[PDB]
Each structure stands twice: as C-alpha cells, then as structure tokens.
Design an enzyme around this catalytic site. Structure first.
Site, PDB file in Angstrom:
ATOM      1  N   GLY A 204       3.118   6.869   8.877  1.00 42.36           N
ATOM      2  CA  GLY A 204       4.531   7.021   8.567  1.00 42.36           C
ATOM      3  C   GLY A 204       5.340   5.771   8.895  1.00 42.36           C
ATOM      4  O   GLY A 204       6.480   5.629   8.444  1.00 42.36           O
TER       5      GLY A 204
ATOM      6  N   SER B 271       4.220   2.597   8.202  1.00 46.21           N
ATOM      7  CA  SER B 271       3.932   1.572   7.192  1.00 46.21           C
ATOM      8  C   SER B 271       5.143   1.095   6.404  1.00 46.21           C
ATOM      9  O   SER B 271       6.007   1.886   6.031  1.00 46.21           O
ATOM     10  CB  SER B 271       2.887   2.072   6.189  1.00 46.21           C
ATOM     11  N   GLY B 272       5.180  -0.205   6.134  1.00 41.83           N
ATOM     12  CA  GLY B 272       6.276  -0.767   5.369  1.00 41.83           C
ATOM     13  C   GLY B 272       7.460  -1.115   6.244  1.00 41.83           C
ATOM     14  O   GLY B 272       8.330  -1.887   5.834  1.00 41.83           O
TER      15      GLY B 272
ATOM     16  N   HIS C   2       0.796  -1.225   0.000  1.00 40.34           N
ATOM     17  CA  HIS C   2       0.000   0.000   0.000  1.00 40.34           C
ATOM     18  C   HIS C   2       0.834   1.285   0.000  1.00 40.34           C
ATOM     19  O   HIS C   2       0.300   2.375  -0.212  1.00 40.34           O
ATOM     20  CB  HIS C   2      -0.991   0.011   1.176  1.00 40.34           C
TER      21      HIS C   2
ATOM     22  N   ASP D 211      -0.159  -7.642   1.838  1.00 40.18           N
ATOM     23  CA  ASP D 211       0.403  -6.295   1.759  1.00 40.18           C
ATOM     24  C   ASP D 211       1.935  -6.277   1.782  1.00 40.18           C
ATOM     25  O   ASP D 211       2.553  -5.912   2.779  1.00 40.18           O
ATOM     26  CB  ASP D 211      -0.170  -5.478   2.921  1.00 40.18           C
TER      27      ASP D 211
END
Lengths: 239, 58
Positions: A187, A189-190, A53, A98
């Site tokens: 912020g 995410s990932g 995402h 994801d």
C-alpha cells in the site's frame, strides 16, 4: 516546494501517525470506488510522480490533501487523471526504472495541506546514512491499511551494504533505505522517500519493492529519483 | 486445467495494494487477493470472469 505549511513531527511497519497535512505532497491513488492501491507525490499543481508497477490508468483518481481515509467528512481533492506517462524503460522483470508520471485533468488547488515536493538534480549526492523519511497508508503489520497517514524515519543505505542482502537484484535506478526497524509495506508503493536538501524536503526515492513480509531488518528498495529525474523533466517539458 | 491454477496466490515483492483474482481449488471459485504490482504468477487475473474461464473446475 519541499516546505510544508504544517511542520511534521518525527520521533509502513513500526512507523508512526503523521501530523495531519504535514506531508502535503502525499497523495493517495484510488480506483473509481475509492480503493487505495498506491501512494504518490505531487511535484507541481498538474503532475504526480508514482511507481510504474502501480499500473495507474486514466480511470483511477488522485486524492490530495488526505489524512484519515476513514473520515468521509474530511475535506479532500479528488483529481481526475488526464494522461499516464509510464517510463518506457521500466523493466517488468527486474523492476528497474520503476517510475510513472500522472498528468491531472484539472490542476490541484494548492493550500496548507496540498503542495509539492522538490525534485533533485541528476547529479545530487545523498550520502549513505542520511536520515530520510517515507510516508503512506501501507500496512502497519504484515490485515487492512491504517486509516491515518503514517511516517517513518530511516537511513539511506550504500549500494554495497544493500547488495549484502539483495545481491545483483539491485539495479542502477534503485536506492535502498531501511533495515533499521521500520519497513515500507503493501500500500506504500509509489509513495515518497524524502530527504532534506538545503532544508527542503526532496524526493530521493519512490517506494518500490522489498521484503515479501515487510521485514524491518531487510533493506527497502526504492526507485532512485536522481537516476530518473532527467526523464521526469523531459516528460514535463514535452507535455 | 493448467496446474498454475492450483498454486496459492502470490503477492510478490512490490509494495502496491492491487486487487486481483486467483482460483482457489479448495472452494472451487475465484477469490480476490492483494497483488504487490510486480512479478505476478499465472494464477493472477484482473477479473473474476477471466479467472473462471481459465481455471474453473481445476
């Protein structure tokens, strides 16, 4: 992999500042202007794993070896992205699967502050209650991002306990953690959710989604790496 | 103009920090906001131009 040259010191909302360079695999994904939009994890000198995402493109850059994003003098590695491999099974509706891999144009130069996190085996079983850690430059209050890298220790939750809140929104390639006083936030995410496997920090989850207000009493939902690692290995092997 | 142009910006449940544009009917222009990366509503554009072409004047 999974062994930082600089050992982390552990006592994101309600987290704490990390020892500089103690999470060497943590990278910052930024646009051409230097704007941080997501985190990521180095799995070797040529590849970074992040969330699907995050929508990373070859125009974005991988920043390794960073601690203080407000420091212009801090030495870092701005790495160009050669190709983006988004898992074709990523469900933009349910947010399942994801995960995205980033192949760097030029390899990262590993050092005391830049190295890789270990990847788990598809059959690995990280028990509920296991104390893991997540890191990132996401908001510390639900506002601008903190300049310095943050960290937080949190427990993995059983799917049954997670579903007590999220119900059927929890899919097979998701694993929950948190609801313990801390929370990943805008912020993060990932970024990584790591747990020790035989003493080595291993990527168990990838910051994905959760409370719309980053509530610390709500389970954070991460992409379950054990359910996606086979896809990771296959992608690396083919490229 | 579409009614979705009158909806406040929606960050969503994902934890990214992606800059997007939304039309603000109170000001009459498109403004930036932080999008979480998933489940975007329609008043969410990748450029101010797209936003103005779709919602301008709402």
């Amino acid at each position: 992999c999974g062994v930082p040259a600089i050992q982390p010191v552990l006592s994101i909302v309600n987290g704490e500042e990390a020892v500089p360079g103690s999470w060497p695999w943590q990278v910052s994904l930024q646009d051409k202007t230097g704007f941080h939009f997501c985190g990521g994890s180095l799995i070797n000198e040529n590849w970074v794993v992040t969330a699907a995402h995050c929508g990373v493109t070859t125009s974005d850059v991988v920043v390794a070896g960073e601690f203080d994003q407000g420091s212009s003098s801090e030495k870092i590695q701005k790495l160009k992205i050669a190709k983006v491999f988004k898992n074709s099974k990523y469900n933009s509706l349910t947010i399942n699967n994801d995960i995205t891999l980033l192949k760097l144009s030029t390899a990262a130069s590993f050092s005391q502050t830049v190295s890789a996190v270990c990847l788990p085996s598809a059959s690995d079983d990280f028990a509920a209650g296991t104390t893991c850690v997540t890191t990132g430059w996401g908001l510390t209050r639900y506002a601008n991002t903190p300049d310095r890298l943050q960290q937080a220790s949190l427990p993995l939750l059983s799917n049954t306990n997670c579903k007590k809140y999220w119900g059927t929104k929890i899919k097979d390639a998701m694993i929950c953690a948190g609801a313990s006083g801390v929370s990943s936030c805008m912020g993060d995410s990932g970024g990584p959710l790591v747990c020790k496997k035989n003493g080595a920090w291993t990527l168990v989850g990838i910051v994905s989604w959760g409370s719309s207000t980053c509530s610390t009493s709500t389970p954070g939902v991460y992409a379950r790496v054990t359910a996606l690692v086979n896809w990771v290995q296959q992608t690396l092997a083919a490229n | 103009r579409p009614d979705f142009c009158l909806e406040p910006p929606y960050t969503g449940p994902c934890f990214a920090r992606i800059i997007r544009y939304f039309y603000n009917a109170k000001a009459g222009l498109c403004q930036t906001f932080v999008y979480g990366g998933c489940r975007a509503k329609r008043n969410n554009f990748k450029s101010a131009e797209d936003c103005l072409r779709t919602c301008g004047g709402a």
